[PDB]
Design a binder for these strands. Structure first.
Ligand code: K
Ligand code: K
Ligand code: K
Ligand code: MG
Ligand code: MG
Ligand code: MG
Ligand code: MG
Ligand code: MG
Ligand code: MG
Ligand code: MG
Ligand code: MG
Ligand code: MG
Lengths: 52, 66, 177, 67, 524
RNA sequence: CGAUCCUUCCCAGUAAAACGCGGCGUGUUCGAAUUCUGAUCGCUUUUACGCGAGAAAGGGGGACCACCCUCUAAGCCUAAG
RNA sequence: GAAACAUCUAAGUAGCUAAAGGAAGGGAAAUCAACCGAGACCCCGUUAGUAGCGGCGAGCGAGAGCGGAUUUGGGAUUUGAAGAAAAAAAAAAAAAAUUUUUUUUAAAAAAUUUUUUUUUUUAAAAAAAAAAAAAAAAAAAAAAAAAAAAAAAAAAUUUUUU
């Protein structure tokens, strides 16, 4: 049943990260890029949205 | 273009020791660097110059003040 | 072209292939330079990645094109080294000289520049030698002295100098005798 | 260690060939100094006349070659 | 007033990465180095990696040489976090640095290895502690017995107690208690009494924890009247009544059959002195929810936040809910729902679902709607960290009631929120279809059928009939023919009565060609 | 045996610009951007590094400017076709 | 070839040289689109001899999308933050149709097996003292690879190990 939704590991890995910004956030007064790249974030978003 | 250096002794038109000054690169690279009259303004050498001058000039100030 | 692999083969043949674990091989693959250097004299100097270029020379009215080349601004200089206390004679481009100015000397440039960017087996050798000598210096300490000890040791050195001079002159005159 | 073994001899060093660098003592050049290796346990303070050095004033050398 | 140095160095490490340009700032910020500064930094370090980085850097940079207390402090936190190889490699490096070995560093290493269940290496260190040349007298054996009988090594602990008492060692009450607990745990009654008469012959008067040892041993031997005999024996021996002893008295009462007796000893709990401790309230509830007594549950649930106390395990809050709801008292479950949301706990979907299921099953429909609305306005369903989900019986009857006897809109809003987590039940969908059809909005029935078609939910024949006739009743025969086409493409043939209805409704509205297209498929 | 982390990397002479070529790269000169105990304002604490709020970095989209969209360069590894 | 020729073409072709592998190279966006969206890399088909470059001559000649083949991403990288002032609840009172206001507040979890010696008791099942193993979590190195018999060594041919 682990291969039914194999994207959940990435989702709860990046869940705290994904709220901060789309491509990056400001930390201690300097811009810092997000942990997950934008193409991979779009893949994860499509995998989430394809099941409702 | 100019460089930052730290004087180790007293140069007549530059200034007193322990001071960072701006020189020409051909002046620093060919005259002050081989004769140990100045060091580059990077953190390790600034710390070294500051502490060694502190230790010696503690004795110098102890002699001069009293 | 495959300079990283031909340098890795020589390093493996020097050090012994049994000596290296696969993780050390993976790490050593990322330190050997994989740059494009073809000209012979760039493997014997500090060029900082400048190469020759071959291109076209084009006339003004006719537009006629004939081959030409652009060469790097190579100069032969002596650079002072802090841990060797002496000059090193190199063939540096002015680009490399300016990078040396930014870094704070030839020694600090060799420490700061990583292994892949050294471009050259001699560059790897010199960075290794400077790093070993700085690690030797990293475990030493100096102790300074009070001015009364300054005067005492100065007097002792004067005594030993004049005694050595007297004994040397006496030995010379007796050997003459 | 790999790069030390690959470029080492075919078969401490702060003496004989090059000696003590002048840089160490740059904040104050005319001062008698004693270099010594740093020990894990606290060392002794006894210093003979042979163990104390001072670049006189003569020195404020040879030259290596890159290749 | 200003700021200290330990907190600002910890704010250096907490906010910036550990680089050499940060180390330069720390080195230029420190005006004079001492072990007091090192210790105040090390205690106040927010994370163990910051602490370890600072302790390594200060000894490798030549700024200071560390001492016994700083080394002990490092080993204590490394072993509490169980960085076992880290603490071992620091410990082995001390006589080269010059500070001596002490047993204080070894005993915390014993406890650190045994916390992870590597207790064999604790015994391995203990056997070579005398080999290494450090005194091994009392506290070392105490910790070894604390760690090997937690795993339950009674037959070893006998031999090592023989080697204790052989090498001129006088054991005390801590030794005897720490071994008696393990011997009672390992089901050794004769060994427990032998080591009790051992401390009788050695001649030391037992205390509150010593008498606690036998009564918890009798609790795990399921002999409770004997424990009560021991409990009046401790009163006749003149030792003070302990709250832990009362707690395990309640535990031994409710272990098998006596569930009312926990309240009966809570009536005597005033004599002991300290009534509201966490463990009594943690253990007393599940026995009486297993039995089914309620007035002695709701009063102490009122008293739970009267003095701000929490249980050890919070699933008792669900077990009391299901027990009280099956008992039948509904008006005091509104104290449970506010006891959930006021201590620390966020309320959960299953927690609200049990109460909505009870208010739905027993003629309290508007109260079920009230709990429904405060459940859906608080978005409890869409919370990721909550574990208990809404049961199928928490929405299966209430969707039916909402669609059949009133409004369908908030029913579909709740169920569309349930799709976003875990539900694709066909029953609530069929009921939403009929409810939206009979309310007066057949567009919603059609779109829910489209939802079923895209999600792959199996579609019935009787659902489309109500949609067709709902379109019929409002004067949209073209929409009726569209729904008829969707029914045929799904694969259900209707009856000739419906065919005759739709063909006449299409003809009388002037839509001749749509009626002819119906005629084509009825011919076919 | 022993619960296994103890460092190739400090990362700008880089992106861009002028002139000359060219397979978007390269020769000679030159050369940035937001934090290095983040800062600013407001609040109590009544004399915090706590709590809140606002604005802050670059590349591209057929010269260029504004708005919008999209991506995060200045050495990570990687099967099959 | 341009019906001559000089920019252009032939062509980054022929040729010379250097290095590496059974494949090499490229590779998971500082990429395309156009306010709607796609989603690493290489190969085959179409768009299309079209857009574009060009003594705007002769000639050179895409990208994106779409259809196939293979179908794959991994790492840095995630964090529990190990247990006077505000918010909230227990009891009393009042009011409205649940809501509003005031007053007092070590242990009660830590789970296991074999062998040897001497005992009690009805070979069954339990008392004491001795040796260990529930460590291969991680990898390397070494010796030895399943029942019964023949030979070598040790000990007292026999037994044990090989
Ligand atoms: K490859
Ligand atoms: K011709
Ligand atoms: K001709
Ligand atoms: Mg543009
Ligand atoms: Mg544009
Ligand atoms: Mg021609
Ligand atoms: Mg061509
Ligand atoms: Mg060719
Ligand atoms: Mg080959
Ligand atoms: Mg390959
Ligand atoms: Mg978008
Ligand atoms: Mg495709």
């Amino acid at each position: 049943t682990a291969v039914q939704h194999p994207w959940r590991a990435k989702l709860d890995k990046y869940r705290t990260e994904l709220t901060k910004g789309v491509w990056g956030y400001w930390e201690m007064g300097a811009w810092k890029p997000l942990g997950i790249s934008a193409r991979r974030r779009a893949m994860l978003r499509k995998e989430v949205l394809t099941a409702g | 273009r100019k460089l930052e250096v730290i004087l180790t002794t007293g140069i007549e038109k530059l200034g007193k020791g322990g001071e960072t000054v701006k020189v020409a690169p051909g002046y620093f690279r060919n005259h002050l660097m081989p004769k140990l009259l100045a060091v580059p303004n990077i953190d390790k050498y600034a710390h070294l110059i500051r502490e060694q001058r502190k230790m010696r000039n503690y004795e110098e100030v102890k002699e001069e003040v009293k | 072209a495959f300079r990283g692999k031909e340098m890795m083969k020589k390093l493996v043949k020097k050090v012994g292939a049994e000596n290296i674990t696969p993780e050390l091989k993976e790490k050593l693959k990322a330190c050997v330079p994989d740059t494009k250097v073809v000209m012979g004299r760039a493997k014997r100097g500090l060029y900082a990645g400048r190469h020759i270029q071959y291109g076209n020379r084009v006339s003004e009215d006719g537009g006629n094109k004939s081959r030409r080349c652009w060469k790097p601004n190579v100069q032969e200089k002596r650079l002072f080294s802090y841990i060797f206390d002496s000059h090193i004679k190199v063939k540096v481009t002015t680009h490399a000289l300016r990078c040396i100015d930014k870094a704070g000397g030839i020694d600090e440039y060799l420490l700061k520049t990583p292994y892949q960017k050294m471009d050259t087996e001699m560059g790897l050798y010199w960075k290794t030698k400077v790093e070993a000598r700085y690690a030797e210096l990293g475990q030493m300490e100096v102790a300074f002295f009070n001015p009364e000890d300054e005067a005492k040791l100065e007097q002792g050195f004067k005594d030993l100098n004049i005694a050595k001079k007297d004994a040397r002159r006496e030995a010379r005159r007796t050997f003459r005798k | 260690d790999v790069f030390f073994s690959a470029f080492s001899s075919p078969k401490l060093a702060f003496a004989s060939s090059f000696d003590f660098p002048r840089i160490p003592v740059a904040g104050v050049s005319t001062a008698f100094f004693a270099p010594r290796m740093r020990q894990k346990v606290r060392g002794k303070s006894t210093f003979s006349l042979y163990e104390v050095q001072k670049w006189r004033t003569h020195s404020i050398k040879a030259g290596l070659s890159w290749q | 007033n200003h700021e200290k140095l330990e907190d600002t160095i910890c704010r250096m490490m907490d906010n910036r990465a550990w680089t050499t340009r940060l180390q330069n700032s720390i080195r230029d910020l420190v005006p004079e180095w001492d072990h007091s500064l090192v210790y105040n930094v090390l205690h106040g370090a927010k994370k163990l990696e910051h602490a370890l980085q600072f302790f390594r850097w200060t000894e490798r940079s030549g700024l200071i040489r560390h001492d016994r207390d700083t080394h002990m402090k490092m080993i204590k936190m490394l072993g509490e976090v169980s960085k076992l190889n880290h603490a071992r490699c620091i410990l082995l490096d001390m006589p080269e640095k010059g500070v001596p070995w002490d047993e204080d560093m070894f005993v915390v290493l014993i406890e650190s290895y045994g916390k992870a269940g590597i207790v064999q290496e604790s015994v391995k260190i203990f056997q070579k502690m005398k080999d290494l040349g450090v005194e091994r007298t009392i506290k070392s054996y105490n910790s070894l017995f604390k760690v090997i009988l937690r795993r339950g090594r009674y037959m070893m602990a006998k031999r090592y107690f023989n080697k204790m008492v052989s090498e001129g060692v006088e054991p005390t009450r801590h030794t005897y208690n720490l071994m008696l607990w393990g011997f009672f745990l390992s089901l050794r009654l004769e060994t427990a009494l032998r080591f009790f008469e051992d401390m009788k012959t050695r001649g030391i008067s037992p205390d509150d924890a010593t008498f606690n040892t036998m009564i918890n041993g009798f609790c795990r031997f399921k002999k409770m009247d004997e424990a009560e005999k021991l409990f009046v024996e401790m009163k006749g021996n003149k030792i003070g009544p302990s709250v832990v002893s009362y707690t395990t008295m309640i535990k031994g009462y409710l272990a098998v059959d006596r569930v009312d007796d926990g309240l009966r000893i809570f009536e005597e709990m005033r004599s002991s002195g300290i009534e509201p401790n966490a463990t009594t309230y943690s253990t007393l509830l599940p026995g009486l929810c297993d039995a089914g007594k309620m007035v002695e549950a709701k009063n102490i649930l009122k008293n739970m936040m009267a003095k701000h106390i929490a249980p050890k395990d919070n699933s008792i809050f669900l077990k009391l809910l299901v027990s009280q709801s099956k008992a039948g008292d509904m008006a005091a479950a509104t104290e449970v729902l506010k006891a959930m949301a006021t201590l620390n706990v966020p309320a959960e979907a299953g927690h609200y679902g049990v109460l909505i299921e009870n208010q739905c099953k027993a003629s309290a429909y508007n109260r079920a709607i009230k709990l429904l609305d405060t459940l859906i306005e608080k978005e409890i369903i869409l919370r990721h960290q909550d574990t208990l989900e809404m049961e199928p019986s928490a929405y299966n009857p209430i969707i039916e009631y909402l669609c059949n006897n009133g409004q369908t809109a908030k029913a579909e809003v709740l169920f569309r929120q349930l799709m976003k987590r875990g539900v694709q039940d066909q029953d609530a969908l069929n009921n939403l279809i009929r409810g939206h059809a009979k309310e007066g909005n057949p567009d919603s029935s059609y779109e829910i059928l489209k939802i079923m078609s895209r999600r792959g939910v199996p579609r019935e024949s009787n659902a489309y009939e109500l949609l067709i006739k709902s379109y019929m009743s409002k004067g949209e025969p073209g929409d009726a023919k569209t729904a008829l086409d969707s029914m045929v493409e799904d694969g259900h043939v209707p009856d000739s009565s419906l065919f005759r209805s739709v063909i006449e409704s299409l003809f009388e509205d002037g839509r001749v060609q749509t009626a002819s297209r119906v005629m084509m498929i009825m011919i076919d």
